[PDB]
Design an enzyme around this catalytic site. Structure first.
Site, PDB file in Angstrom:
ATOM      1  N   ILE A  32       0.789  -1.247   0.000  1.00  0.00           N
ATOM      2  CA  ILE A  32       0.000   0.000   0.000  1.00  0.00           C
ATOM      3  C   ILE A  32       0.817   1.291   0.000  1.00  0.00           C
ATOM      4  O   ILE A  32       0.257   2.370  -0.101  1.00  0.00           O
ATOM      5  CB  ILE A  32      -1.016   0.029   1.169  1.00  0.00           C
ATOM      6  CG1 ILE A  32      -0.316  -0.131   2.527  1.00  0.00           C
ATOM      7  CG2 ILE A  32      -2.054  -1.064   0.980  1.00  0.00           C
ATOM      8  CD1 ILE A  32      -1.190   0.184   3.728  1.00  0.00           C
ATOM      9  N   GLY A  33       2.128   1.190   0.125  1.00  0.00           N
ATOM     10  CA  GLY A  33       2.952   2.370   0.213  1.00  0.00           C
ATOM     11  C   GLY A  33       4.398   2.033   0.029  1.00  0.00           C
ATOM     12  O   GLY A  33       4.814   0.880   0.162  1.00  0.00           O
ATOM     13  N   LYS A  34       5.179   3.049  -0.282  1.00  0.00           N
ATOM     14  CA  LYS A  34       6.610   2.882  -0.417  1.00  0.00           C
ATOM     15  C   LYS A  34       7.348   4.162  -0.038  1.00  0.00           C
ATOM     16  O   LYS A  34       6.762   5.254  -0.041  1.00  0.00           O
ATOM     17  CB  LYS A  34       6.952   2.458  -1.849  1.00  0.00           C
ATOM     18  CG  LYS A  34       8.155   1.531  -1.907  1.00  0.00           C
ATOM     19  CD  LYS A  34       8.209   0.744  -3.206  1.00  0.00           C
ATOM     20  CE  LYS A  34       9.263  -0.352  -3.134  1.00  0.00           C
ATOM     21  NZ  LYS A  34       9.981  -0.500  -4.418  1.00  0.00           N
ATOM     22  N   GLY A  38      11.440   1.845   3.303  1.00  0.00           N
ATOM     23  CA  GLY A  38      11.041   0.502   2.912  1.00  0.00           C
ATOM     24  C   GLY A  38       9.640   0.492   2.343  1.00  0.00           C
ATOM     25  O   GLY A  38       9.307   1.293   1.433  1.00  0.00           O
ATOM     26  N   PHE A 105       0.967  -0.769  12.567  1.00  0.00           N
ATOM     27  CA  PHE A 105       0.195   0.421  12.871  1.00  0.00           C
ATOM     28  C   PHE A 105      -1.298   0.169  12.714  1.00  0.00           C
ATOM     29  O   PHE A 105      -1.730  -0.771  12.031  1.00  0.00           O
ATOM     30  CB  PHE A 105       0.609   1.535  11.940  1.00  0.00           C
ATOM     31  CG  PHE A 105       2.006   2.018  12.167  1.00  0.00           C
ATOM     32  CD1 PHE A 105       2.277   3.020  13.096  1.00  0.00           C
ATOM     33  CD2 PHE A 105       3.050   1.507  11.422  1.00  0.00           C
ATOM     34  CE1 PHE A 105       3.563   3.489  13.294  1.00  0.00           C
ATOM     35  CE2 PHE A 105       4.344   1.971  11.607  1.00  0.00           C
ATOM     36  CZ  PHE A 105       4.601   2.960  12.554  1.00  0.00           C
ATOM     37  N   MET A 107      -4.761   0.948  10.911  1.00  0.00           N
ATOM     38  CA  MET A 107      -5.051   1.215   9.513  1.00  0.00           C
ATOM     39  C   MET A 107      -5.622   2.614   9.328  1.00  0.00           C
ATOM     40  O   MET A 107      -6.608   2.954   9.949  1.00  0.00           O
ATOM     41  CB  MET A 107      -6.055   0.193   8.993  1.00  0.00           C
ATOM     42  CG  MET A 107      -6.236   0.245   7.486  1.00  0.00           C
ATOM     43  SD  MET A 107      -4.702  -0.171   6.622  1.00  0.00           S
ATOM     44  CE  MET A 107      -4.978   0.688   5.080  1.00  0.00           C
ATOM     45  N   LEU A 108      -5.012   3.416   8.455  1.00  0.00           N
ATOM     46  CA  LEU A 108      -5.484   4.793   8.184  1.00  0.00           C
ATOM     47  C   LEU A 108      -6.042   4.932   6.748  1.00  0.00           C
ATOM     48  O   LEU A 108      -6.149   3.947   6.029  1.00  0.00           O
ATOM     49  CB  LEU A 108      -4.350   5.799   8.444  1.00  0.00           C
ATOM     50  CG  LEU A 108      -3.947   6.023   9.909  1.00  0.00           C
ATOM     51  CD1 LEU A 108      -2.799   7.018  10.003  1.00  0.00           C
ATOM     52  CD2 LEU A 108      -5.109   6.515  10.720  1.00  0.00           C
ATOM     53  N   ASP A 154      10.264  15.867   8.297  1.00  0.00           N
ATOM     54  CA  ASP A 154       9.858  15.456   6.957  1.00  0.00           C
ATOM     55  C   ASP A 154       8.346  15.546   6.818  1.00  0.00           C
ATOM     56  O   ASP A 154       7.658  14.564   6.468  1.00  0.00           O
ATOM     57  CB  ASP A 154      10.353  14.035   6.633  1.00  0.00           C
ATOM     58  CG  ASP A 154      10.181  13.670   5.135  1.00  0.00           C
ATOM     59  OD1 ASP A 154      10.378  14.543   4.253  1.00  0.00           O
ATOM     60  OD2 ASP A 154       9.823  12.528   4.852  1.00  0.00           O
TER      61      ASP A 154
END
Ligand SMILES: COc1ccc2c3ccnc(Cl)c3n(CC#N)c2c1
EC number: 2.7.11.23
Length: 349
Positions: A32-34, A38, A105, A107-108, A154
């Site tokens: 779902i993300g990068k 990682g 984590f 879930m958002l 960031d």
């Protein structure tokens, strides 16, 4: 050429496989993300009967040792904040798996870039921008409490996520670049668009660098486009100079990298570096007025908010005034979160 017994790829990342069960507990749905750190995957937690997000840190020392700090800092924040209150993602647990540190984590929902994209970069309403600003300032108030004294380092649309698809509630994520006021450990930091003058200039920094980011972010959230979209450090500093002018002599006098962007006249004033060949690429200093970027008196950014409600000229004047206080060149005087929350821009209904 095998990497980590064939579980990783050539870039120290774990090769994700949809439907894989980990440790007889987590069922991996999809990637779902990068990012630099990682990967992040959506997964179901059999034990707790809930969907989670698992951040799979890269299998390399330098990246591990950095996630170790993210853990220390999240655990420290979730400890004060045990009501899932203060606008910071929740670290449920963590574990080592096939030589990768994994962080689990809650879930958002969408991040704020995805949300800009969704309007085809037309911007979200000023009312909604206010809400994100109120929360973000509060989160940044939290981060500043002296026990914590945490610099996020960031901030950017992509690292602010909604809780729920159809709701304004938000949480800040990714404290992988983060540190505390004393333990400062880096030089080249923050994403470039949202990087502060002091960092560009190679000066020491404190929590105020997040406020700068926040200012860049709020403008981008309403207009659709980054306030300072610089292709590298010299471009970036020059785009800031268009809008805000030359940085005060007292700052540049102290900046080790001042001369990367500027030069000091015989008479002691500073100026942009002398350029070449009748080239001109930027607008002169201070010329790109934020007043016009927001379109204070011309119906909002791009006139697209013309004769809408809750976008009066007065709303914009407040919103503008806040943003110039957030982008104060001097970090000793850049509005701090306590005071920002008291600004006119939040006076109520
Ligand atoms: C969509 O749900 C989530 C939930 C937590 C996270 C999360 C927590 C810590 N660091 C990062 Cl980078 C995180 N992302 C990034 C992405 N995609 C999350 C996404």
């Amino acid at each position: 050429k095998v990497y980590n017994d064939g579980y990783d790829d050539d870039n120290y990342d774990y090769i994700v496989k949809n439907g894989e069960k980990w440790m007889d507990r987590y069922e991996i749905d999809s990637l779902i993300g990068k990012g630099s750190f990682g990967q992040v995957v959506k997964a179901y937690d059999r034990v707790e009967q809930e969907w989670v997000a698992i951040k799979i840190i890269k299998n390399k020392k330098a990246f591990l040792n950095q996630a170790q700090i993210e853990v220390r800092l999240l655990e420290l924040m979730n400890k004060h904040d045990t009501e899932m209150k203060y606008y910071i993602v929740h670290l449920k647990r963590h574990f080592m798996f096939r030589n990768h540190l994994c962080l689990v984590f809650e879930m958002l929902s969408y991040n704020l870039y995805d949300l800009l994209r969704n309007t085809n970069f037309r911007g979200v309403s000023l009312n909604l921008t206010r809400k994100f600003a109120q929360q973000m300032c509060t989160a940044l108030l939290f981060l500043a409490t002296p026990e914590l004294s945490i610099i996020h380092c960031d901030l950017k649309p992509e690292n602010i996520l909604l809780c729920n698809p159809k709701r304004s509630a938000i949480k800040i994520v990714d404290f992988g670049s983060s540190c505390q006021l004393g333990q400062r450990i880096y030089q080249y930091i923050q994403s470039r668009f949202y990087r502060s003058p002091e960092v560009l200039l190679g000066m020491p920094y404190d929590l105020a660098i997040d406020m700068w980011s926040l200012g860049c972010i709020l403008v981008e959230m309403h207009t659709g486009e980054p306030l300072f979209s610089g292709a590298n450090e010299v471009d970036q500093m020059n785009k800031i100079v268009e809008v805000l002018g030359i940085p005060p002599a007292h700052i540049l006098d102290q900046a080790p990298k001042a001369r990367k962007f500027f030069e000091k006249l015989p008479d002691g004033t500073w100026n942009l570096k002398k350029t070449k060949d009748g080239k001109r690429e930027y607008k002169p200093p201070g010329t790109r007025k934020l007043h016009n970027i927001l379109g204070v008196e011309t119906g909002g950014p791009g006139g697209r908010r013309a004769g809408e409600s809750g976008h009066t000229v007065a709303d914009y004047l407040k919103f503008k005034d806040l943003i110039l206080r957030m982008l104060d060149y001097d970090p000793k005087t850049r509005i701090q979160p306590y005071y920002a929350l008291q600004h006119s821009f939040f006076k109520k209904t």
